[PDB]
Each structure stands twice: as C-alpha cells, then as structure tokens.
Design a protein around this ligand. Structure first.
Ligand SMILES: *[C@@H]1O[C@H](CO)[C@@H](O[C@@H]2O[C@H](CO)[C@@H](O[C@@H]3O[C@H](CO[C@H]4O[C@H](CO[C@H]5O[C@H](CO)[C@@H](O)[C@H](O)[C@@H]5O[C@H]5O[C@H](CO)[C@@H](O)[C@H](O)[C@@H]5O)[C@@H](O)[C@H](O[C@H]5O[C@H](CO)[C@@H](O)[C@H](O)[C@@H]5O[C@H]5O[C@H](CO)[C@@H](O)[C@H](O)[C@@H]5O)[C@@H]4O)[C@@H](O)[C@H](O[C@H]4O[C@H](CO)[C@@H](O)[C@H](O)[C@@H]4O[C@H]4O[C@H](CO)[C@@H](O)[C@H](O)[C@@H]4O[C@H]4O[C@H](CO)[C@@H](O)[C@H](O[C@H]5O[C@H](CO)[C@@H](O)[C@H](O)[C@@H]5O)[C@@H]4O)[C@@H]3O)[C@H](O)[C@H]2NC(C)=O)[C@H](O)[C@H]1NC(C)=O
Ligand SMILES: COCc1cn(CCCCCCCCCN2C[C@H](O)[C@@H](O)[C@H](O)[C@H]2CO)nn1
Ligand SMILES: [Zn+2]
Ligand SMILES: [Zn+2]
Lengths: 933, 929
C-alpha cells in the first residue's frame, strides 16, 4: 500500500506538526562513548549509533519523512565511521530537508551553570561542522531538557545565533498552570534589556514533556497499540487510532494559539529502530488526513515556527529568564547550581586556559586540532552538557568527563609550552621547553620547589591573555628563605614570604597522590610573593636565585576571632558585616512529601541551618595581609587583602563533609550586614547581564511560596551583589555557584553539598563524592571575592575583576643562567602595538586559528547601558593595533557562531502584546570576525 | 570503515558458519496476526513485520550478508502489504542468495500430533508460493523447535521434498549426552524401513539450543557487549571479543565432526531491528578473520551442509525416529500427544472435509482460493504449527485457531453445497441448495430434526470421497418413529431406530448454546439408522418420508452383566478369541516434589461401572456404560463392521479436590506381547516400540509410564503368536503399553499447574457462558485378527475414519427430485475402484488449467501378502468424464520436476497414463485437461 505521507499544512483545520526526534544526553547514566556504541545497557538501554543508522535508513525509504537531530558530539563521532556512500546519502537527506539540524551545538548545554564563552565555543564547533559538510544554518533552538532557562539563552544563544525560535519543555510548575490558562506557553522572548526587540525569539514552552502524547510512543519492544489497517488481518482498528489522535490534538489545541500545534515524537534515546516510529506516523498521517477532521504532517520546529509566524496572531511577551525551575511543591532544582563544585571549577579553569592556549598557538603559527580525537575542544564542549558541568550525571560518568578534560588539558599545556618557547626566543620548539603548574591550590609545583643550581636562576615567564596591562601577585611554593626576584632589568623586586600552613600541607599529601599517582616530596616551607607587571597580550620575565584591622591598601577589614567590618578610607564606604559558615540539613522526605534533597533538587530540612570558630594566624606584610580561620575540622578559610586589590579574596576549604551522623549537609557562607536591601539582589546570566531578583516574588505569576530558601536560589557564573542608598556590596565567584539573599542585608553562597539520598529524578545516586587510594569525602578549595563601593561604582570592579578571574596570568618555568637567557630570549613582549590597550570596557573573548589561514576573532563589550557612566558607552577597537606584528589582508563580519555573513541575517516579524579595520562596540555587544593574514 | 564480510570457507581452519534466523511461532503466546503486527507486546515482545522490514533493509546494505526465513504464513501476510519496489528488491535478494528460505512450509509443523496429509498440504502451499514468486526450491529442512522428531519427517517431509538436510535443536537429554561423547549429533538419517538410503537426509541436531553462544545474542535493547573497534573512542575491545568468539567455537568443535560448525544466530522473534545483529556479525567476521586462528563467514544451513558433504568423512547412521522427547529426568514431553483433544479432533475432521471439498470443487469447475484471506488452506496450514494442533499455545491463541478453522469450514461448506447442487443437476448454483450438519456428535441436525411436509421427502445425498466403493451406516436424528427410507430405485431399506440417551441430551443443550449462541429446539427423540451404499468418488441419494453378548455379525463381545464392562472379544468366522477387559482410569498430575519441582502440564506428562442399556437390532448392537458422572461410553458393533466402535464422553474433569487428572482407557488382555507395541509415524509407517528401551542409548528409566507414551495419528497395536489386537484413533492421541498384553490411550487431560516451559497456563480448558471443564466426545476402534491379517483392517479402516461420507440434505417431493437430479453418480469409470492398497490423498484444482494429483500406497512391504505388492492406477479411468491432455510427475511438494531431482552421496557407518505404485510410495502429478 501507498501512504499519502506528503501532506503539508492546510488553512482551516487544526494542523498537527509531527516532529520526530531523539533526546540524546552527551553522557548521563552512561558515558558519551558508552551511549554512542550502546554498551552497558544494563545501566540504561541506549545506543546513539542505532539512532543515526536506522533514522537514515528510514528517511531513505520515503522522501516525505523528517527527523531532527541536535548534538554534534554524537553526530561527528558517527560521521567519522560512515562510508562515502552513506555520507552522500546524508547530504541528500539534509539537502532535501528530511534531516534537519536543530540547535546544532556540540551538546545541548545547561543554561544555569554555564559561561557564555563556553556556550559560544561549543556551538561554534557544531555549527562550523554543519556549515562545512552541508552548507546548512540551523534556525530553531532546541533546549527541550535543560532545568530552567537563562536570559542569555534567549537573546544571545538564540536570536543572535540566527535562530527564529527556541523550544523547551521545562518551566516552573506554577508558571505552567498560569500559561495554560492564559495560552501563554508560546511567547516572544526578549531576554536582553539592552537589545529588546532587536534580539528577540519565538519561545515555545511545551505543554508538559518533550515526549509524544500518551499512547503515541512507538519505540521497538514497547507496548503500544499498532495501527492495524489490513483487512486481511483480524482486529483492524483504524477509526479508533484516528480518534485517539484527534482527542490528543484537541486537548493540546485548547491551550495553544493558532490552528498549529506541535507533537515532539520522541524521547530519551528513542529511535533505536526508527522504522517502528515512522511506520506508525506514516499510517496516522494517511488515515487521519483521509478522515479530514484535523490535518497531520511531518514537520520540524522551524516549519512549525514558520506556520506560527504566518498566522494572524498577537503573542504575549516574555522578559528576563525562567529561573529558578521547580517541578513540584518541594522540588526546586536549585541544588545543581552548586552540585559537583570541583568539576565546575575544573571546567572554568580549563576554559580560561583554553582561551589563552588558542591565543598563543595563533601567534606561534600552530595548526588547528579542533576535530582531532580527544582534543580539548571536544572535551570542553561535552562538559557543557546539561548533566555534565551541572553536576547531575552518575559518578562514573562524572569521572569520565574529568578524564577527557585532563587529556585535553595535557595537549593544551604542550601547545602553550612550545608556543611560549618560540615566541620568547630572538615554530618547532619542544613542549619540554617550559614546565607549568596547575596544582598551586594544594601547593604542588616541582619546578619552583626544586633547588636552583649555581650560576643559574629559576626563570619565571608570565603571560597575560587579557587585552589590558595587568599588575598581579605571583605566589609560588619554595624551599629557600633567601631568594631574590629580579625583573628583566636586573632590579631586585620587593618580596614577601608567607609560611606554609597545615591545612594546605595536609591537602598536598592526600591529593597529589590521588591526582598524580605518586606521593610527593615534603610540604614546601614557604610561599614566595612578588608583584608582576605584564603588557596586554604579552609577557614579562623574572629571575629568582639565591642572594584587629588589616589591609595594606585602601580596603580595610576588622576582625575579633571573626569578620566585623569592611571600609574604604579613600571612597568613604563603611559597613558592619559578619561572615560565617553554616549548612542546611538535607531533607530526606517528611510526612507530607517524600521528596529528598539530591544532586538536582535543593530541599532543606526546614530546620534552621546549624552554626559552626577561632583565628589561627594573622599575617601582615607589604604584599598581603592574611587572616587564617578554622571554623571546625572540615571548614577553614583564609581571608586575604592583597596589595593594589580593591577587594578581599576569601579562600574556602570545605570537606570532608561528615555524614556518619546520617545527616546530609549543604554548606553555605553567609555575609550579614545592615544594608536596607529591601528584598532585592542581583545575579548574572551566564556571566553577562545582571538580573534583579526579588525575594519570594515572580514577575510572571503570583508565586505561592513553598520553599522560602530553596525557592530564592539563583545560578551564579560571575557573582551576586546588593545595594541600598549608601552602599553596594558585591561578591564574585570562581566557578558556577548557587547564591541567594534570604534576609535583607544578607547574601549567601552555597559552596559544597553531600547528601545521603537521591532526589528521584533518575540519576539513582546520592551526591556523595569521595576521593580514594581508604576513602573520604571530597574536599573543595576555591576563592570568592568581596568588595564595597559607592552606588554606581561597583559595576566596574565587578566587570574588571570578573574578567581577571576568568583569565589569570599563565606561568612558565625553567632554570637557566640569567645572562645566557637574556642573550637568546626577549624578556618582554606584546603582540599588540607597544602603546595600545583594549578599552577598559572590552574583552578579547575569542582569538583562534581555524583551518586554512582563517582566524576567528570576537570582541565583547562587558558593560550594560546603565552600569558605568564612563564605560557603559560606545567604544572602538583598532584591529591594526591589535595585530601589530601582522597585516590584515581580509576582514569579514559573521554571526555569533560564525556560520553566516552578518549582513545577510534576517529576522521574523512578530506582533507582541504591549508594543581602516576599526570596530565600534556598544554596551553588551559582541562582534565576530573571520580574518585572513 | 569497510569490513571484509565476503569471507568463504578455508580448508586449513575451523570454519564457523554464521546463520542469521528468527524463530517465529505461527501463534503461541499471541495470535498469528498479533505476532505479525506486533500488538499485545505486554504478553511477549514480538513483531514479525519488523523482522522482515528490517532484515530486507539490512541485507540491502551489504551483498555479503545472509538471512534464512521459514514460515510462509507470516511471509505471505507481509508480502501482500509490500510496495512494488520492495517486492522487486526482495526478488533481487532472493536471487542473489542473500535471503534463503529454509523449510518453506506455511508453518514449522509439530511432528508428533500431525497427519502426513496435512504436513504435505501446508508445505505445498508455502513451496508453491516460493516457486512462483522466486523460482526457488528450498534445500534445507528447518525443524529447530518441534518437541521430538518423527521418522516421516526425515524421509517424507525431508528427503522426498528434495531437502539435503534437516536441522533441529531438541533431542532427548540422555541421547544428547551420548551423542556429544560420540560426535553423533549429526547423522545420516534413514527414517523409512522401506526406502532406506534412497530416502536419506543429513540430520543435524544442535549441541543445545537454536540460539547463539552465550554473549552473542545481539537483539536491540539487550545487554550484550558491542565490539568497539573505533580508536577515536574509549574502551576498544577487539581482542576480547575475538577471543570470546574463538573460545565458543573451539568448545563446539570438540563435539562436532569435520572442520565446519554452524552457529544459529537468532532466537524467538529476534531481528526486530536486524542491523543490531548484522553490525556485530560484520565486525566479528572481519576481526576474527584478521586474527586468523579460526574462520568466520556468513552462511546458510544449505551452504553448511554442502561443506559437510564435501568433507572426507563417514557419518553415523540414524534409523526410526526421535520420540519421545524429554529435556529432564521428570520432563517427558508426552502430554501434548493428547493435550487439547477437542482442537485435535477439530483439525482432523476439517482435514478430511477439506480433502472432499477440493475434490468436489474440481469436478464442478470452482476456482482455487488457496491464497485468499481466511481460506481454509490458511487456517489448516496455521493449525499444523508446533504450538497449535500440539495443544501447547495459550488458551486465547487456541480460541483464535478454532475461529480461523470455523471461518474456513464455513467457506468449505458453501463450496461443497454449491458443487453438489451442480453435479447432481441435469458452476452457478447457490450454497443454499443443501444443508449440512457438523454437530452429529451432540445430536444437533436441524435439517433432519425438522418436520417433513406432506407430499415431500427428506432428500439425503451421500458423497464418498474415497476411491473405494463403501457401505456404511447413516445415522441421523429424527422426530418421527414411522419414517420409511427408500433408495434411489424405490426400494424400502431395513432401518433401525435407536433411543436418545440422557448423556447426549445434556451435551446438546449446553454445547449447542456454546457453539451457536442459542439453546436448541427440543432434543430429538430417535436416531434413524440405515445402511448406505455409495460408489467411489460418487454419490447415492436416499428419500425419507412418512409412511451379556452382542454382535450382529462375525465379531462378538461379552460383557459381565454383573458389572457391565468388556470381558471377551471373539470372531466366529476367523476363530480369534481373547479375554480382554476395558477400563477407564486416570493418572494424578504431579505438581512436583521437594527434589524436583517439575509439574505435569500442556507439554509434559509427569504422573504422580455399570451397563445402563443393552440394545440389539439388525444395524447395531450397543452397550451404554456409565463409569462415573463425568465418564461414559457406548460400545457399538455395527452391521458389516469388522470392529467395535467405542464412543467415549469424558468431562467435565473434576478438579476441586485440587488434583489434576489425565484420563486413559486401558485394554488389558493376556497376550504375550513381550514389552513390544507398534505405533504409527504421522499416520503412516508403524514403528516397533519396546517398553523402557532405546535403540540409540542405554536408557536410564526415570518415568516408567511417561517415558513409554508415543504419539498416535493412526493407531496402536500389539501381537503374540496367536492374535493381533489393534486400536485406531479419530484424532492425534498418546498411547502406550505399560504392561504386557495391555494397551492404553490418554483421552483427555486437565492440570492445575503449568509445566514451566513458557506457555504460563495450566491446561485447564473450560466452556463458559457459568463455567465448567470441557467435555470431549470421540471414538476409538478395536478389532482382533489372526497374525498378518490385522494390517489390512488398520489401513482400510484408517482411511475410512479419515474420509467419512459427506451428507447433504434438502426437502423435496421425491418424484420431482428424481426428475431434475441425477440420483446416482461417480466421476470415475462406472465400474472402476482404486486398488485396496491405494488412496487418493490429493486432488485439487490449481490456477490456470493445472490439477494437482497424489496417490499413496498405504502398505509397508511386510504387512499384507496380497496388498503389500506393486500395484497400478489407471488415470484415464480415474477421470472418466474428462480427457487427460498433459501429465507431469513432480516432487512431493510439487515444486520440482520429479526426473531432475538430485541426491547427495554420503559415506555412512555400517554400509496410456497408468501409475505404478510400490509399497509406501506417494506419487505426485500435475495434469492438464
Ligand atoms: C586543585 O586544582 C585542580 C585543577 O588543577 C582541581 O581539579 C582536579 O585536577 C586534576 C588535574 O590537576 C584532575 O586529575 C586528573 O583527573 C582525571 C580524571 O580522573 C578521574 O577519572 C579517572 C577515570 O575514571 C574512569 O575510569 C576508572 C577506571 O576504570 C573508573 O573507576 C571511573 O569510574 C571512570 O570509569 C568510567 O569511564 C571509563 C571510560 O573513561 C569506563 O571505562 C568505565 O567503565 C566507567 O564508565 C579515574 O580513574 C580517577 O580516579 C582516580 O582519582 C580520584 C581522584 O580524582 C581518586 O579518588 C580515585 O580513587 C583514583 O585515584 C586512584 O587511582 C589512580 C589511578 O589508579 C592512582 O593514581 C591514585 O593514586 C589513586 O590510588 C578520577 O576519578 C585523570 O584522568 C587524570 O589522570 C591522568 O593524569 C595523571 C597525571 O597528570 C596520571 O597520574 C594518570 O595516570 C592519568 O594519566 C593519563 O592521562 C594523561 C592525560 O590526562 C596522559 O598524559 C597520560 O599519558 C596517561 O594516559 C595515557 O596512557 C594511559 C596509561 O597510563 C592510558 O590509560 C590513556 O589512554 C586513555 O585515553 C586514550 C586516548 O589517549 C584512550 O585510547 C583509552 O581508552 C584510555 O582511556 C593515555 O593513552 C588526573 O588524575 C582531577 O580530576 C580534578 N578534580 C576534579 C574533582 O575534577 C582540583 O579539584 C583542585 N583541588 C582542590 C580545590 O582541592
Ligand atoms: C515460577 O517458577 C519459575 C518458572 C519459570 N518458568 C518458565 C520458563 C520458560 C522458558 C521459555 C523459554 C523460551 C522458549 C519457549 N518456547 C518458545 C517456542 O518458539 C515455542 O514454540 C515453544 O512452545 C516454547 C516452549 O518451549 N516456569 N516457571
Ligand atoms: Zn537530557
Ligand atoms: Zn517455536
């Protein structure tokens, strides 16, 4: 029999857009490769190779069939295995529109715990591949699973990518009720207060889930009702199945605007045998359309959006974001804003490093390795997956993520070493030319710990990957107490010695062995500190050889023994402020609700958070004032006021979190003032826009308060701040972190979490992270940064220090005779014009060599219009001065993901309820260029 | 990457022939159509449409891949839904050898409870489709699942089909141990005593199961280890999987002759997503052969057989059969020999009716409808499946089988009625011309129960589908006591009235309602009996209108009187005389003990009186016997019958005491049978069985009852130096001789537990409206003869039991009838019979002008001095009203020129139009008129 599968939309009937898809997690209960090859099916039945294999076969069978695929991490692995014949069939299918890429990034990223730089990076990775192989530009965003949604997702990873639409299943459960009643599930979304309608997108919140209506899942071996239309066989059931379809369509139509609705015909890792689904959809399209009451068609999210746009309809407006997300009364998904802190820091650290790595490789002439096996691009793009950096994957999967990141970090570390060796001489240098250290956090750095032979000096090369000149404190572990630091010009520099502490030494012994496999030499005796000064996008070289109020600067802090006050003499801000460590007790269920706190969901006990305190050292010196604090045996902190820093730097060391008492614990630091913050506080969106949050309040619906704490937590990637008439109090993070203001004048950060129960959303594991050789709970160490400012003065600290945290100096070490080194190496350099700096409001967020001679460049304006009277303004960058030592032959502006010419981008129109080489940049703008040299 | 999937065999290595297959039950836990379309997956995950869809896609991707498929019941349902492009693609795959048909019948039939005529019929239905669509002749028999194997499967449904091999997984568990030790899993099997090596076949019994070695089932969503050979991905495992493969190959090689072994790469309803299997098999062939220690290839059972035949090797010999089957000490699969007796009788009755239907349609010029939806050919073909007539499907599946058979029977009924209307007239006649009755067993025949109008008669047309003239008793239910029966010439015939009985009357009210939905009219008051005389392949017409020792003939029986119940049988003309008792007993079903939990069930048999009337008359003497409230019997000696007909009525089997019961009739004599007894092979050859003994291995006796039951489709007999005692059945039935001079039949079974082989249902058959246990009624036939004179009774009466007269009824004034209708007729020559040794088992109109004809010699060489000899049939006299234009002798399934059939050679350890037939021969022909 021939089925009429080629139906399009029809004007005066309800149209049911059948969109076949397979939701393929880039790691979750299995690793990425396990999901691809289909191993470990006892954990979860899932094989993405079967999906792509069988979908291509089913699409070949009938030209009217369609399927949408998203995650290029899987597609690219599959593609490299396919024959030339298959690759050509795929080209035909993509060219015909039968297989359409939706989203098209390397993964479907989390939107809470991700940084916009990483979101752009992996999306570009996917889009370049799709553009190269198929000459296709994705037009529909696909965020069907991420646990809430960010403003930047809407305007920057949606509209600015060229997406007309973005589709997602998860919104807050109270909000969803209101949107159904108001038919506002689909909105025109303006995530940017700066760009408004110039960066808007059609946003489609599904009625419930991203699966088919009940009885319309057709996966092989499932117990569905096949449409039996053969009169030679018993029990035909055509009329019943057609009515099943209509009934489901009418229910959805009752909550949707226009005569067009969409069915997401798929689910988690479905389509292992695609024909099982397409057989049923073939028959349903055929028989439903013969019936004639409604109209069914094979479609895609972009065909659907096109029909939604051509309709005569005005649409409700959506501003800001969809955080936080709850799927039930006691189930706010705000715990994963913090879950797996160590993995979050690892991602953030490697992202900064990878940024610098691509800079140095470009100058030294290195060749792109983006699509090579186990490259850091693959590893960091996988890491953005919505179960990966978010913390919501199984532990073995999480270990596999970190294994892949470490492999890519090792490749990047060799690129940096070889590149700096070439660029500092007076490119083929060996990677052994310099040594580098990434375990300063636990004091392990063999290059600076080892002894210096006579007539030689420890050479320290300092590379600065910001487009600003920078002054910073180098702090290295040493075993000699009479070293001299000389700058490039022979002058001895002022130094300070800081004594090794017992917390750090105790971390060193355990974790060096865990990470590196062998037990290290004795704990270093001292830290050596000195202030380095480095040109923008350049290096300085130093030579090292043998011969209660604190605050070396304007910012002062007062302690008992605990913090009591912060003030700035020069600016005249002064608040009494206390900081303490506490923890919420993790709920394990109660009489009214079995929901437990777990890796996704933060549900505190409803008991007040238990209190922890004594000073163990107060240190004073020209470069740093320090207060070492121990709150208990597993919570210790160091507060540091460094020379020339407009902030304190608070180093936390948390763990092992004790659960032998059977009580899960979610550890916070809480900063309590008297500022009249009036329930307001500000948190960033993926590290960019600041969103005004209001305690216990929602703009889009009248919140029913059910979790007065968990319901006020928001995801941080840059930081959190508060203000009143007289002060502005700001906190910056070093990794994705959850933050809230639970009381006026009060800010808190959740820093580490260890539960005894799983939260029943499918991961099947309490968040119980341990380190072994003889195991104990994982300890995390990191920094948060705090400062005080007059109103309208804090934004420039937040932006400037945020970028500095993102992009620290890179240190490279070797031992050579100083004079011999100065004879064969330039001790100072800059790749920009010697007297050029990027404006203070701009960051060079992408600089990378692509295939052939093409260079990808991105410049970001860091400020929103109303933040800083001087810097929230129009500025310019002279690219001739940015590349002083090279001549631009070609310049070309492209879309954010570099898959379209900027000038060719077109926008849909919506009726919304309530309505030379010099590059200019307005507030919040990001401009992307392809260059040739 | 490209994989070297084109490997062939290599001489200096062990070769693993990978044979992809999907074992598709034609009904079992789900019905055949549910299995096809994949509905009711909560019962069992199984969809045959997916198998054929995805296998054809997978074969298309790589020309070196192969797959074997067997069950045309499924293939044909799928074929008619396919597009022209798919059909064209399938023809290319079949022509290239990528898709090979094995077996090729409509189903994979049981070999215990099936009759050879039904086996030939459904195999022909499948093979004719295969030949017409693809010009292919299957060469491998595929019997991987049936529970034991019959001698007729080997020589007749194997060798004579043109099969070089037959493959099966199930043999007795004790036999299997010996055959592993002696490397005699594979044999040259000679199932026929008569034909020996002229009808031999390579018989391959698998080491254990028909699935793959452990860890090589690759069905989508199963937890197997994929072969990961991409160095860009973590956890490559090529070495591990290659070694897994080798270890399994070497283990099998140690119990197999030659350097070729076969892996059956599949299982029940597998290959829903075929690419999941072929991907792994692609990579295993590639990397195993790169390694080079063993050799792997895509293969088929026929390619494997060729390799085994080409080896320089001598093979052990197998004779007789593989019954009974047991897979454990207390697990003899001999219960299903009797399970679902009523379904078995239903199949047997419809097979004979379908034989007559195709004769009558041919004579009347009816067009063939063999491949039409719900045709009786489909229903009867399906019913041969190894869970169907065997009785081992779920109850709802069994109901569906009976519904398809009833649909087919209703169509056959109209053909018979329309054909007889045309042929007796002086085809376009309507089905309403005659009525017919199939419920005589419960006394329900409205056409004869109904009053006759004055100046009209009940016209009775009697058709005889045997090639022998036949006299037999017509016995119809009537409501008037003074009816007169005249033959066609006007002669009044001797009649006998027999009173209705209470047992039948209560069956009638309950079962007529069950079968037809409404209670019947008043029970009929009498049976009218009379003797009809009918030409072979012809008819006689009769007109009915208003006007303790027994034995009306030579055979006599003596009953105690004090207790009822047989005591003695003797024939006064031949001098045979044996004391003999007949009793009803039951075994208690085991529900397992603490040492073995095995219970009795649908597959496995695991065991733990007054005369109410004596009737005498010129046409029948009978003794009604009531053994208890749910067991009654009537023993009948009919005029001119050389045997007693013993009608049992059993049920409802009481089950409330908590114990299951398996009911037998046991005939006990003093004959010196010396542990020997004789049972038939699919209604054909008799095999000598010996109590508690096995020819091929030293039996360890664990079930001295259950291990001595054998499947009967014709009957069972014993003998000593003075007598032969013979028992014929009317349906597939289990029988045994548990002591010397003693013979027993299992007639009905009801268990309270399942026997744990997958059907998940106690054998607990019930009739519901209120429910009660099912009641079965049927006949077995007893007789006594002098040695070497019993065989001719068994063969002749067996064919008469198989092919009874067909009665057609109407009411008309006699003279107006005789004026418009030929009262008497035959389609053969007016004075020609087939020889007494011959039966016309097939006569059928195919498409175009082709007619299919089969003649069978009923006798084995040693059986009857007169009839066990070469004979001949005159085809011009068989077809008297037509002229034979063309004759062509073909193979048994009619897919080959008989003259062009080729046989492999094996070295075996220990070594006009007149049709001639030697003993046990079946010759098949295509004729054109
Ligand atoms: C501070 O700061 C810092 C920063 O800096 C932070 O962070 C950190 O960091 C660090 C660095 O620094 C890091 O570390 C790193 O890490 C990574 C990861 O780790 C993880 O993972 C792993 C893995 O896992 C997996 O596996 C296992 C086994 O099986 C298991 O168990 C698990 O579960 C998983 O599993 C999964 O997956 C898989 C796949 O993958 C599958 O198969 C399965 O089935 C599943 O599914 C692990 O292992 C680990 O663990 C460890 O550790 C821990 C801790 O962490 C502990 O606790 C434990 O216990 C352990 O430990 C133990 O052990 C060890 C070993 O044995 C020893 O040693 C010790 O001692 C103890 O006892 C974890 O979990 C990793 O990966 C890395 O590693 C690496 O590296 C090192 C040096 O560096 C060494 O030592 C090692 O060995 C390694 O090495 C390697 O790699 C490299 C790169 O990466 C290279 O270069 C080299 O060469 C090597 O390699 C090569 O070779 C080899 C031989 O040996 C091989 O294997 C390879 O291969 C591969 O790949 C390829 C390509 O190429 C392919 O083909 C194949 O397939 C393979 O695979 C190559 O070839 C390190 O360690 C960490 O992680 C971090 N952390 C976090 C948390 O994240 C921190 O945090 C801070 N701190 C504070 C603040 O406090
Ligand atoms: C509660 O205690 C434990 C327990 C378990 N079980 C049942 C185990 C059943 C195994 C079935 C395996 C698969 C094949 C079953 N075949 C499939 C063939 O295609 C079909 O034709 C055969 O009829 C049929 C039977 O052999 N019982 N009790
Ligand atoms: Zn997901
Ligand atoms: Zn079977």
């Amino acid at each position: 029999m021939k089925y009429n599968t080629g139906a399009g939309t029809v004007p005066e009937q309800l149209n049911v857009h059948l969109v076949p898809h397979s939701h393929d997690d880039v790691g979750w209960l299995k690793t990425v490769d396990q999901y691809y090859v289909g191993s470990e099916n006892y954990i979860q039945e899932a094989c993405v190779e079967n999906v792509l294999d069988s979908v291509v076969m089913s699409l070949q069978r009938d030209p009217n069939r369609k399927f949408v695929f998203g995650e290029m991490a899987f597609f690219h692995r599959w593609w490299l295995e396919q024959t030339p014949e298959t690759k050509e069939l795929v080209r035909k299918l993509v060219k015909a529109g039968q297989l359409e890429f939706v989203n098209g990034g390397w993964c479907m990223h989390d939107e809470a715990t991700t940084h916009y730089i990483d979101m752009i990076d992996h999306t570009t990775l996917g889009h370049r591949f799709i553009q190269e192989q198929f000459n296709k530009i994705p037009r529909a965003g696909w965020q069907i699973d991420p646990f809430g949604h960010s403003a930047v997702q809407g305007y920057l990873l949606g509209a600015e990518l060229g997406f007309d639409s973005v589709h997602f299943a998860r919104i807050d459960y109270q909000d969803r009720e209101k949107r159904k009643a108001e038919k506002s599930l689909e909105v025109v979304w303006r995530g940017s207060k700066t760009f408004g309608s110039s960066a808007q997108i059609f946003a489609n919140a599904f009625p419930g889930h991203y699966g088919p209506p009940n009885g319309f899942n057709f996966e092989v071996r499932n117990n569905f009702v096949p449409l039996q239309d053969d009169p030679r066989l018993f029990d035909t059931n055509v009329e019943e199945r057609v009515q099943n379809f209509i009934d489901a369509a009418l229910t959805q139509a009752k909550i949707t605007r226009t005569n067009h609705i969409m069915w997401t015909m798929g689910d988690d890792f479905q389509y292992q045998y695609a024909e099982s689904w397409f057989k049923q959809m073939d028959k349903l399209i055929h028989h439903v359309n013969k019936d004639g009451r409604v109209n069914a068609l094979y479609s895609t999210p972009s065909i659907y959006t096109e029909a939604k746009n051509a309709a005569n309809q005005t649409w409700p407006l959506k501003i800001d974001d969809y955080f936080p997300y709850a799927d039930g009364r006691n189930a706010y998904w705000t715990g994963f804003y913090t879950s797996r802190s160590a993995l979050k820091d690892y991602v953030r650290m490697l992202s900064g490093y990878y940024l610098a790595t691509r800079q140095l490789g470009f100058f030294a002439g290195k060749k792109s390795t983006k699509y090579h096996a186990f490259d850091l691009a693959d590893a960091l793009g996988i890491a953005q997956h919505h179960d990966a950096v978010s913390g919501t994957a199984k532990q073995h999967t999480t270990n596999d993520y970190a294994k892949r990141l470490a492999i890519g970090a090792s490749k990047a570390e060799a690129v940096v070493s070889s590149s700096l060796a070439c660029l500092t001489s007076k490119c083929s240098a060996p990677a052994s030319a310099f040594s580098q250290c990434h375990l300063f956090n636990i004091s392990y750095c063999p290059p600076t710990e080892s002894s210096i032979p006579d007539d030689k000096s420890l050479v320290v090369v300092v590379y600065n990957p910001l487009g600003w000149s920078r002054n910073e404190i180098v702090r290295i572990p040493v075993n000699d107490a009479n070293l001299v630091v000389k700058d490039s010009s022979g002058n001895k520099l002022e130094v300070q010695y800081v004594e090794m502490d017992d917390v750090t030494a105790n971390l060193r012994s355990f974790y060096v062995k865990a990470y590196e496999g062998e037990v290290p030499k004795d704990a270093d005796v001292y830290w050596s500190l000195f202030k380095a000064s480095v040109p923008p996008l350049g290096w300085s070289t130093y030579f090292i050889s043998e011969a209660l109020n604190i605050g070396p600067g304007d910012l002062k802090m007062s302690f008992s023994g605990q913090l009591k006050r912060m003030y700035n003499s020069k600016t005249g801000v002064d608040i009494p402020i206390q900081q303490n460590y506490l923890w919420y007790e993790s709920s394990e269920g109660d009489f009214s609700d079995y929901q437990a706190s777990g890796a996704y969901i933060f549900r505190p006990n409803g008991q007040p958070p238990p209190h922890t305190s004594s000073v163990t050292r107060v240190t004073r010196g020209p470069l740093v004032d320090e207060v070492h604090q121990k709150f208990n045996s597993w919570i210790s902190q160091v507060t540091r006021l460094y020379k020339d820093k407009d902030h304190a730097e608070i180093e936390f060391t948390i763990g092992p979190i004790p659960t032998d008492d059977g009580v899960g614990k979610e550890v916070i630091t809480r900063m309590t003032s008297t500022m009249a913050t009036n329930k307001e506080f500000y948190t960033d969106s993926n590290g960019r826009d600041f969103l005004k949050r209001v305690r216990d309040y929602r703009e889009d619906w009248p919140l029913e308060v059910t979790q007065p704490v968990a319901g006020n937590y928001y995801p941080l990637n840059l930081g959190i701040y508060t203000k009143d008439e007289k002060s502005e109090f700001s906190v910056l993070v070093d990794r994705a972190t959850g933050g809230a203001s639970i009381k006026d004048g009060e800010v808190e950060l959740m820093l580490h979490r260890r539960t005894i129960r799983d939260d029943g959303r499918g991961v099947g594991e309490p968040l119980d992270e341990q380190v072994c050789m003889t195991c104990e709970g994982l300890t995390v160490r990191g920094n948060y940064y705090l400062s005080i400012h007059k109103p309208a003065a804090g934004s420039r600290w937040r932006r400037t220090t945020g970028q500095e945290i993102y992009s620290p100096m890179l240190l490279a070490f070797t031992q050579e005779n100083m004079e011999n080194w100065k004879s064969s190496h330039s001790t100072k350099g800059i790749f920009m014009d010697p007297n050029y700096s990027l404006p203070p409001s701009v960051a060079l967020i992408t600089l990378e060599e692509l295939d052939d001679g093409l260079v990808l460049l991105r410049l970001a304006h860091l400020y929103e219009p109303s933040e800083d009277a001087e810097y929230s303004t129009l500025t310019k960058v002279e690219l001739k001065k940015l590349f002083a030592t090279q001549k631009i032959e070609e310049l070309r502006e492209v879309s954010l993901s570099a898959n379209q010419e900027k000038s060719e981008m077109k926008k849909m129109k919506w009726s919304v309820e309530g309505d030379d080489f010099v590059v200019e940049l307005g507030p919040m703008e990001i401009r992307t260029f392809l260059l040739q040299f």
